[PDB]
Write a protein that binds this ligand. Structure first.
Ligand SMILES: C[C@H](O)c1nccn1Cc1cc(C#Cc2ccc(OCC(N)(CO)CO)cc2)on1
Ligand SMILES: [Zn+2]
Length: 299
């Protein structure tokens, strides 16, 4: 059967919250079968735990925030993208503060730390959500869609209206059967356009933001002296964001996501609409990994 996965060993990391600018200590711990991904604020007494599920999303402004009463875990999307790309079902994510550390702005450091610790298969069938019907949400010129597909693929189209894109929309499609999340998506960084800076300022956001954790773009060019990691790094990062948000479903997807100028807000509306429409999805397991429409790396 395709089995559930956890971490083989504990992972420790330190860094800064993109939004908060706070120093944060992160611990990823193995978790039992059917735990899912659970964030824990260990700075609070008692400890406050928030399952990484669509129902716990409280804010979708420039990040995905989990909320339980007055308690937040901000910017979950890049870490959750890492745990989706590595097929992790069960893990405790402990944080000493309100935000996941930004690291280099990408999922790269997370996939490296996790794959350094290793994964552990568990004696329970991995549960998948299979898309059975098309599910579409729009608002204005933004759209986000689930389409039936015997695999997992993400398509994204952005029109950022900026010289750096040379009058073209940026588009990419990745099928994770045939294409490496690790090599082709995980290294795509957070980006900040200087034209958004008075907005971020106005909102007291991106307090931890610098060239160390984001592609910084002025009116014309990437200012990062070492340039881009991918020719299309902006749209590859949008794909990374969407994989992170999609993992709030609580199970790996069998289907296709299409985004059209979509972001955290519309991604989370799509999830809510999918969950609500039980005609459009079912939970499936695979007794034979050889005949399933997806596969995983050795643990
Ligand atoms: C998190 C979400 O999933 C996400 N992923 C991709 C983009 N975003 C949204 C976002 C982007 C920023 C930023 C930023 C930022 C980066 C650098 C920066 O530095 C500007 C400067 N002061 C250098 O320190 C001048 O160069 C300022 C803001 O904050 N939220
Ligand atoms: Zn992001």
């Amino acid at each position: 059967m395709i089995k559930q996965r956890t971490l083989k060993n504990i992972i420790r990391a330190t860094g800064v919250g993109l939004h908060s600018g706070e120093k944060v200590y992160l611990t990823l711990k193995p978790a039992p079968v059917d735990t899912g991904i659970v964030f824990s604020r260990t700075d609070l007494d008692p400890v406050v735990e928030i399952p990484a599920r669509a129902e716990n999303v409280g804010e979708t402004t420039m990040s995905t925030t989990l909320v339980k009463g007055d308690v937040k875990v901000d910017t979950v999307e890049h870490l959750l993208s890492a745990m989706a790309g590595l097929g992790i079902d069960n893990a405790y994510v402990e944080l000493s503060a309100s935000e996941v550390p930004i690291m280099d702005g990408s999922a790269g450091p997370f996939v490296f730390l996790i794959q350094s610790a290793g994964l552990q298969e568990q004696e329970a069938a991995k549960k998948f959500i299979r898309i059975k019907r098309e599910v579409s949400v729009e608002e204005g010129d933004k759209r986000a869609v689930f389409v039936p597909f015997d695999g997992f693929k993400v398509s994204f189209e952005i029109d950022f209206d900026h010289p750096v894109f040379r009058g073209r929309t940026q588009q990419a499609s990745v099928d994770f059967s045939s294409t490496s999340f690790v090599k082709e998506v995980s290294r795509a960084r957070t980006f900040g356009f200087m034209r958004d800076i008075e907005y971020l300022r106005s909102q007291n956001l991106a307090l931890g933001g610098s060239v160390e954790n984001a592609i910084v773009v002025d009116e014309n060019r990437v200012l990062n002296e070492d340039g881009l990691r991918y020719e299309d790094e902006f749209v590859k990062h949008k794909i990374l964001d969407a994989i992170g948000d999609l993992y709030l479903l609580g199970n790996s997807l069998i289907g296709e996501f299409r985004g059209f100028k979509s972001g955290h807000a519309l991604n989370n509306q799509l999830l809510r609409t999918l969950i609500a429409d039980k005609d459009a999805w079912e939970v499936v397991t695979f007794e034979d990994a050889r005949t399933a429409p997806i596969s995983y790396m050795r643990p």
